[PDB]
Amino acid sequence: QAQKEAIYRQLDQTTQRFNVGLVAITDVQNARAQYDTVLANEVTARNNLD
């Protein structure tokens, strides 16, 4: 859960940077991929507890 919060904040920061315009679209795609990976990891951990 802590990792998910941190990764979501990082993704939001990257999206803000792109919207203002500081980084290319590849960084945004990479951040979104990392966020999706973290979501899958959270689902796996929940199922492990169950």
Partner: protein, 49 residues
Amino acid sequence: QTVRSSFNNINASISSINAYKQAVVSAQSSLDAMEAGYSVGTRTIVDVL
């Protein structure tokens, strides 16, 4: 217990599928970036490989 575990496995697999699809999209974007840079003249063949 087996039924419960097998039910949870499917949802885990769905989430993994979504994550891997997004990762594939990001990798394709990076490859297109490398190819465009190579064609323009700012990259080498090793980068696109």
